[PDB]
Write an enzyme that holds these catalytic residues in place. Structure first.
Site, PDB file in Angstrom:
ATOM      1  N   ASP A  18       0.721  -1.097  -0.111  1.00  0.00           N
ATOM      2  CA  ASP A  18      -0.074   0.053  -0.095  1.00  0.00           C
ATOM      3  C   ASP A  18       0.746   1.431   0.146  1.00  0.00           C
ATOM      4  O   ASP A  18       0.209   2.337  -0.574  1.00  0.00           O
ATOM      5  CB  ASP A  18      -1.063   0.103   1.064  1.00  0.00           C
ATOM      6  CG  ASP A  18      -2.039  -1.044   1.167  1.00  0.00           C
ATOM      7  OD1 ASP A  18      -1.918  -1.889   0.190  1.00  0.00           O
ATOM      8  OD2 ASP A  18      -2.801  -1.341   2.052  1.00  0.00           O
ATOM      9  N   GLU A  42       1.423  -1.801   4.427  1.00  0.00           N
ATOM     10  CA  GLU A  42      -0.026  -2.282   4.266  1.00  0.00           C
ATOM     11  C   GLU A  42      -0.882  -1.234   5.198  1.00  0.00           C
ATOM     12  O   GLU A  42      -0.461  -0.739   6.139  1.00  0.00           O
ATOM     13  CB  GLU A  42      -0.203  -3.576   4.822  1.00  0.00           C
ATOM     14  CG  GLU A  42      -1.583  -4.142   4.679  1.00  0.00           C
ATOM     15  CD  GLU A  42      -2.098  -4.542   3.387  1.00  0.00           C
ATOM     16  OE1 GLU A  42      -3.588  -4.383   3.350  1.00  0.00           O
ATOM     17  OE2 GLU A  42      -1.515  -4.536   2.436  1.00  0.00           O
ATOM     18  N   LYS A  88      -4.414  -0.230   6.368  1.00  0.00           N
ATOM     19  CA  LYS A  88      -5.911   0.047   6.534  1.00  0.00           C
ATOM     20  C   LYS A  88      -6.474   1.390   7.248  1.00  0.00           C
ATOM     21  O   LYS A  88      -5.752   1.931   7.853  1.00  0.00           O
ATOM     22  CB  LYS A  88      -6.027  -1.491   7.258  1.00  0.00           C
ATOM     23  CG  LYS A  88      -7.500  -2.173   7.196  1.00  0.00           C
ATOM     24  CD  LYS A  88      -7.380  -3.734   6.800  1.00  0.00           C
ATOM     25  CE  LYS A  88      -7.064  -4.126   5.541  1.00  0.00           C
ATOM     26  NZ  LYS A  88      -5.876  -3.838   4.906  1.00  0.00           N
TER      27      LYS A  88
END
EC number: 3.1.21.4
Lengths: 313, 311, 313, 311
Positions: free
Chosen positions: D54, D64, D66
């Site tokens: 990401d 990553e 979120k």
């Protein structure tokens, strides 16, 4: 003084207009991923590019889009991991094949799902013949597309911006010729239009593939680049090891930083400035059992802290 | 590699922002009429340029605004054709004096109506006595403004934009140094900023007779126009057959400007200008041995017979 | 909700394009000094406007340019202080007369210095007849220009941007109609295109000339404006006195601040907020011997400090 | 006077700069997919979005990323079709969790490879036992990230651009308040920012059945598309003859978006959509009593038979 750099500057505003036009039409970079080529196609066909399927017309129909440079190959590539989930997807939409010659569109062909079935069959029958094995990038010949497709001409369906593209075309043509004079085959692939800026600025000559470039005096160089808005690490080598390192350690490296289609900055690091990386990478190779490293990166911050700026503010 | 041209390319986006900044402040061209200088005084003082009074503050006071370059002169030019009627306009407004050194503002002084009374009345005595004649360009000395003036410094009254200016200054300075190296004294005067783009493209350098020289020792006349303002290049204000004979010996370089950027460069050889030399040289003799006051070379003549070097 | 404001927003990008085009061609504000009208003329004729003479062609010849709105008058004005230094200047160049009908160009006429001599003579002979007296804005009749001039048509001499102007024209047309629906005669004079923005924003209706405007409820207002990039004081009255003040003191004032062709901000001050000015101006009137004041100004800073912002950020 | 539309016009140049700012940071649309939110986390953390990992920092570490909206949920959605092969990718990277409240970032936590080991291995046990089946959207709780995570604050590692962001924030906040007043919960989600332009132009307000209502009490369905992405408006994912009967009772409003701005608004009366209602309602019966999965209304149908309200 420098007639090739003068030419660039004089052609630039129109390269910028072409970039603007590509952006308006959903193409992020003209000098990468056939950006400047895809634009021709979109404008001729009246298509909207999709960031699933590759494009959509104004009636909502979607398409797969494939393209080749006839100067280099005669087969349209497909999917590296070819499976029946991929194939059943393929059977649902017409395909647009684009045939470029250099940077220019030469032909556009449309194939309906029935004109491609021959390939969907021989692909899924040999998937099973070999039992549950995904095919690696199988080819559809240009000859086949030309025989069963219906060729597409500029028409009433083309986008009005086609005429703006036509007006820009002659400057793009001359820019491409400039790139070729400096050893870059295609301004619209592999950052070609950006690289040309780097070579004109530095006075470097590319070396046909050894090292990447050479100056007038005969000094050779590794030449790396990044699009800073996309990444912060420079690429090195997909199979990094002590052998690649012994070659590297003998030359300075040139590091080009692009932002958009423009050169933001150029830096130079001497062999002594990269010894930290060579050493880091050799130990890692051995530590892993004499195992090649997959493209380890040099951070732009490292480059900016230890290198000499040859261009930028 | 051409390291000076490279330098200009890296500096350019900043030169552009500076120009964008000056046009936001009512300055059309940073590279003409001290634009890049005046921008500093407007931002320092919080002043806004007026489209007869030179400037206004947010509180309404309206001022007259004069300036000089200390490097070149000590006197504050006043007016070529001033009368004693003018002086009543001159007298209802504090003046603002800007003293620049090269491209940078060195000092700003505000004198009040009361403080110019020595000078008005000296010129009002000048008009009467000499025989109702106009005083050409009188000069208020800097020592007189320094002595009787109130010095203005950066402060709370300065435009918030002054911050952008200070962040662009390193680039403007470096661009000015590049100019100097190429024989141009002032980027903010006489299209200084544009002429440099000309030199870096053509490989020419200004001469301290002929205007410019390349590496080989070859010399050139060099004329330029701002296309939005003029359509014919100029020549000599007192043109004589001897000026023409110098003209005949060198090729000419013609620069067409459009805003702050160079739009085109054309070269003409001595044979392409013969038609003009011959016509002026004769005209001189015809009219009766009298100098020609700056005959023009049309831009269309240059585009028709020149070789385009940049466009 | 507000269909006239919706229309403006939908027409705006093209007003902005027209403004851009005028700027490119040397006209600072389309909504002032016949800006949007002069542009038509420059594009038809192929002329470069001069910031001495009014325009220059590409051959270097210069011109005087005069214009009228046929809807309002039949005489071209000239010079308020008409002298022989002015006249001898006039005899040196051809003149371009422009005849507008509303915002549209209706005719363009060229007159050579000999076609105007009749006026140079009757002007300098009556200068002397009255002994050293400068004439006040003497008129050349439209009838005279039409009889002795040569009418100019769109041609091969027109600027390529003429077609961009033509493409924009229909939106400019509709914008003008919008202004007229709101009591503004001409978007290209007296800040008309800006004022329309102010009226749509505030819901004000102009009062034909009393006070300047009225709201739905029946409240009336003085309405003043400035181009902030050009000035920092609001205009009031060229013959300021206690009588003008007694009228003013009965209504709130609306203060519009334009930057370029756009509305930057709108403020409202109540009668109590202007009492400082009324008082200042009355005392000044008396102090000067019962003498009218020539357009005294209200500073924008005062307006911003004491007024209520109805629009802006 | 229309004071809410006026408010949008005064706010707009700032909304534009915000959008310009997000596209400079690799965010295409502030008004979709939490763009205007993610912009805050990238600027706070000094991160750059990657075109499987990401995000990346200037030092090369790849993460990553979120996020959730605390107002609506407590669980950090993970993956719909996750396998135990994925988890080896998931395992070589620190994750970055963003917790928003409405449009504002409330907290940022960085967990290291070591700190997610409880969850990978719980899902790796999930796959085996149940019978080699995919776990749909598992959820890591916020308490688990809060407890085991390292909180990230504004600092020296933040992008210099964060300063521009903070200066635009008052305007973004005020625009968000305007949205809320008109029944739109989140400018930075579901074209929230664009839909408001729609409402202020049409005089509509969102309903807490039918999508919107005017002042007179009249209600509307309201569909929109981003033209660069889709050419047909959507309808209902489980369309049934009863949905059609509600559709038939109201006029529809169709909004065409182009970037962050509203490009066109069309209205269709119930008679202009009869053709579609009739075709779907029958098709339902034909196919064998089965719901229709979101049939589309072509944009060309809307332009051909609608009345244009804005364009």
């Amino acid at each position: 003084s420098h007639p090739d750099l003068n030419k660039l500057l004089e052609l630039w505003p129109h390269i910028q207009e072409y970039q603007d036009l590509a952006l308006k039409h959903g193409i992020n970079d003209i000098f990468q991923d056939n950006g400047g080529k895809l634009l021709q196609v979109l404008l001729i066909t009246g298509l909207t590019v999709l960031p699933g399927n590759d494009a959509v017309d104004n009636a909502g129909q979607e398409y797969e889009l494939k393209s080749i440079n006839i100067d280099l190959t005669k087969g349209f590539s497909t999917h590296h991991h070819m499976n029946p989930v991929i194939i059943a997807k393929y059977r649902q939409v017409p395909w647009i094949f684009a045939i470029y010659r250099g940077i220019a569109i030469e032909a556009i062909y449309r194939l309906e799902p029935k004109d491609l079935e021959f390939y969907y069959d021989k692909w899924e029958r040999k998937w099973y013949s070999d039992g549950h094995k995904d095919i690696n990038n199988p080819k559809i010949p240009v000859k086949y597309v030309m025989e069963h497709g219906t060729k597409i001409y500029g028409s009433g369906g083309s986008h009005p911006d086609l005429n703006k593209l036509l007006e820009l075309w002659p400057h793009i043509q001359e820019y491409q010729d400039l790139a070729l004079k400096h050893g870059i085959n295609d301004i619209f692939q592999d950052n070609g239009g950006k690289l040309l800026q780097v070579l004109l600025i530095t006075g470097l000559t590319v070396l046909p593939g050894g090292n990447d470039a050479v100056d007038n005096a005969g000094q050779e160089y590794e030449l790396k680049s990044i699009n800073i808005d996309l990444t912060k690490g420079f690429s090195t080598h997909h199979h990094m090891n002590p052998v690649i390192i012994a070659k590297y350690r003998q030359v300075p490296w040139i590091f080009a930083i692009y932002r958009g289609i423009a050169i933001e900055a150029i830096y130079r690091l001497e062999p002594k400035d990269l010894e930290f990386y060579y050493d880091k990478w050799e130990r890692k190779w051995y530590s892993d059992g004499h195992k090649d490293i997959n493209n380890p990166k040099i951070p732009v911050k490292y480059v900016m802290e230890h290198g000499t700026k040859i261009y930028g503010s």
